[PDB]
Structure 1
Amino acid sequence: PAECSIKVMCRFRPLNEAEILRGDKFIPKFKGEETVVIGQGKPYVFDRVLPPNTTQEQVYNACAKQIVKDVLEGYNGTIFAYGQTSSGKTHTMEGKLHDPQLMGIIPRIAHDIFDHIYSMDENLEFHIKVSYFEIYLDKIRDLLDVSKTNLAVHEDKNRVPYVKGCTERFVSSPEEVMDVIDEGKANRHVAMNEHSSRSHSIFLINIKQENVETEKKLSGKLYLVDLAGSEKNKSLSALGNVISALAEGTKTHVPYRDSKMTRILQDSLGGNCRTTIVICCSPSVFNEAETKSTLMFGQRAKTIKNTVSVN
């Protein structure tokens, strides 16, 4: 039965040069470990607040660590990064893919996943399939086979959407999860900045396990989405409307089908999935306007209740 809240974490980048040279004072104010205040305004509260100075490692421990242990326990997970362009979504989700200090969530999840698996007992054998694809103008494009540029969404026995005909790499080590991502990153350059900022890159890790003697199986999808600019569109709207029709709930029946993304994330947004959104904000007043709508989107998101089961 379970019933639990979409966690929501807030990560502010620091000021970059454009700003620091142009002056720019640091607008946001951090009280305790869960609350931020902008100027004289109302104070926002989230599951965590994560200033510029917090490390990748600590961002991981705060937002992701737990979602990993959920997937190994048979639950679906999903983390994603919402926010405006330049706000630090990719740094949080990916980071310097190969630096152990500067590496983001996906590589860390990769390592954490296999440290757990390696330590487990000989029976219960794991298969892990990953896939990597982006979205551009309501169209899915495979990052492991750039031949495929228009995959369709379908539904399983439980009437829940998945992407079909998606290349699948099989992995037995963190290092392979890395080369898969690197493949994808390369494939992209069969084209680019403007492109990336306005594509949604979705990285999917499917983990199936089976206790061999007892023959009982657990399973979970783990979506790790790096969303596009939510600034002032198409795909984010559906998500927002799909994230608006739920602070109230009741009889609304969310559009979901407004976009493929939402259709894929159906289960993440009011289904059998532990979901944790990371919202990324600039600390500059230049950007204040968007920072607030971001925060709105966040604050709203925390109201939603995922009903989750072991799968």
Structure 2
Amino acid sequence: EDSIKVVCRFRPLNDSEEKAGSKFVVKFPNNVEENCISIAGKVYLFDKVFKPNASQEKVYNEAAKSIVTDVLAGYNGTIFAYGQTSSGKTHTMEGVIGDSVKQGIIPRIVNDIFNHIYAMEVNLEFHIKVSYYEIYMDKIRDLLDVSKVNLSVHEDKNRVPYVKGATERFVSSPEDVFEVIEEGKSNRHIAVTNMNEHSSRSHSVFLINVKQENLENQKKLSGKLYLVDLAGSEKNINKSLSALGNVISALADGNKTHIPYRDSKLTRILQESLGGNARTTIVICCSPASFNESETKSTLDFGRRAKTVKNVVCVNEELTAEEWKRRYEK
């Protein structure tokens, strides 16, 4: 009963763009609900629309709303950034780590997780593991350990697609996690000639597995929290992105059956995120430039279609076979 949240961010018109004679051609009819864009005769409504002067913090407050609360209550949650190259996926997911104002969703998330744990009463033992890898040309390289290239996907005991053989690092403070991110960022350069080119055509996948045990209940909860910065969505295209569209499309109205998750590694990893058991926000990012009109329009279409999709979401309680049997009676 849980619509995928879709949130739309326009960046400021930049230089290449004024000086190549691109006009700013986007409007924001309002509202009051502040959730609407007009481009060249089309009109779109989402959960929020952010204007070029919207700050990382403001954006974080909407996009990452309950997610850390949710993940700490044992819900899976995901955020990913979708749109063409240079529209601001990385600015948004990452921004400038270390800069208070200019940092993006991931780092805020990270501080915000630990602050919540501290301020938490009830004595709970947190195991927190993190992974960081990329999908490029439908192949997975672990950024934490570059000998693990071309990794494979497999389903688990619950039949949830996970990436097998990937480094999972324990962490106990923000500084820990940031050290891991900085590790991954240089590893990504290994064998890479043009990083602008490489990262615009690959998916960066950041994963925070959050296990909690209550040291009285004996109650174990769990939450997978995925932060993803996609390959650029431009044209045709980049094939995991057709897969993403095809999965989105197949989820319309109804419909939980015959869904082409396997069409790509990406879409397998994101399986719960789209239709399954997670709360999912998507940030679509857009240029406001006239030159980018059709690319913007499709990003918005994609957005349009994805808004309508509803997830099947519950607490990930960790039970033994015995308990689950009993928990069944009426």
Shared fold, TM over 0.5: yes
SS in 1 for 2:162: strand
TM-score (norm 1): 0.97
Q: Is the 8 A contact 1:6 1:301 kept in 2?
A: yes
Mapped partners of 1:166, 1:78: distance in 2: 19
* Cα offset, 1:24, TM superposition: 2.3
Write the letter of the residue equivalent to 1:118: Y
Q: CA RMSD in A?
A: 1.1
Equivalent position of 1:240 in the other structure? 245
- The answer to whether residue 33 in structure 2 is matched with residue 29 in structure 1 is no
Greater mean alpha carbon deviation, residues 12-21 or residues 267-276: 12-21
SS in 2 for 1:290: helix
Equivalent position of 1:144 in the other structure? 144
Equivalent position of 2:308 in the other structure? 303
Equivalent position of 1:60 in the other structure? 60
Write the letter of the residue equivalent to 1:209: Q
Write the letter of the residue equivalent to 2:35: E
Q: Indicate how the Cα distance of structure 1 residues 271 and 285 shifts in structure 2: closer, same or farther if over 3 A, else same.
A: same
* Cα offset, 1:153, TM superposition: 0.6
* Cα offset, 1:122, TM superposition: 5.5
Write the letter of the residue equivalent to 1:128: I
Mapped partners of 1:251, 1:182: distance in 2: 39
Write the letter of the residue equivalent to 1:10: C
SS in 2 for 1:109: helix
Q: Is the 8 A contact 1:65 1:109 kept in 2?
A: no
Mapped partners of 1:79, 1:118: distance in 2: 24
Equivalent position of 2:327 in the other structure? none
- The answer to whether residue 268 in structure 2 is matched with residue 263 in structure 1 is yes
Mapped partners of 1:209, 1:46: distance in 2: 34
- The answer to whether residue 278 in structure 2 is matched with residue 280 in structure 1 is no
Q: Is the 8 A contact 2:206 2:227 kept in 1?
A: yes
Equivalent position of 2:218 in the other structure? 215
- The answer to whether residue 9 in structure 2 is matched with residue 11 in structure 1 is yes
Equivalent position of 2:325 in the other structure? none
SS in 1 for 2:44: strand
Greater mean alpha carbon deviation, residues 187-196 or residues 71-80: 187-196
Which residue, out of 211, 225, 234, partners 1:231?
Answer: 234
Deviation by residue 1:35-77 (Cα, 9 ceiling, x = unmatched): 01113x1320000001110000111001013211110111000
SS in 1 for 2:290: coil
What are the equivalent positions in structure 2 for 1:149-160 lying under 5 Å apart?
149-160=149-160
Mapped partners of 1:216, 1:252: distance in 2: 33
- How many pairs are equivalent? 308
Q: Is the 8 A contact 2:136 2:203 kept in 1?
A: yes
* Cα offset, 1:175, TM superposition: 1.2
Any gaps of 5 or more consecutive residues in structure 2?
317-330
Deviation by residue 1:172-195 (Cα, 9 ceiling, x = unmatched): 111111111010001112122111
* Cα offset, 1:307, TM superposition: 0.7
Write the letter of the residue equivalent to 2:36: T
Which residue, out of 253, 256, 261, partners 2:258?
Answer: 253
- The answer to whether residue 82 in structure 2 is matched with residue 77 in structure 1 is no
* Cα offset, 1:251, TM superposition: 6.8
Write the letter of the residue equivalent to 1:144: L
- The answer to whether residue 21 in structure 2 is matched with residue 20 in structure 1 is no
Mapped partners of 2:256, 2:47: distance in 1: 27
SS in 2 for 1:287: helix
Mapped partners of 2:247, 2:59: distance in 1: 26
Mapped partners of 1:61, 1:18: distance in 2: 31
Equivalent position of 1:87 in the other structure? 87
Mapped partners of 1:182, 1:122: distance in 2: 33
SS in 1 for 2:110: helix
Write the letter of the residue equivalent to 1:180: V
Mapped partners of 1:37, 1:75: distance in 2: 35
* Cα offset, 1:250, TM superposition: 3.6
What are the equivalent positions in structure 2 for 1:126-205 lying under 5 Å apart?
126-191=126-191, 192-205=195-208
Greater mean alpha carbon deviation, residues 263-272 or residues 21-30: 21-30
Mapped partners of 1:249, 1:241: distance in 2: 15
Equivalent position of 2:321 in the other structure? none
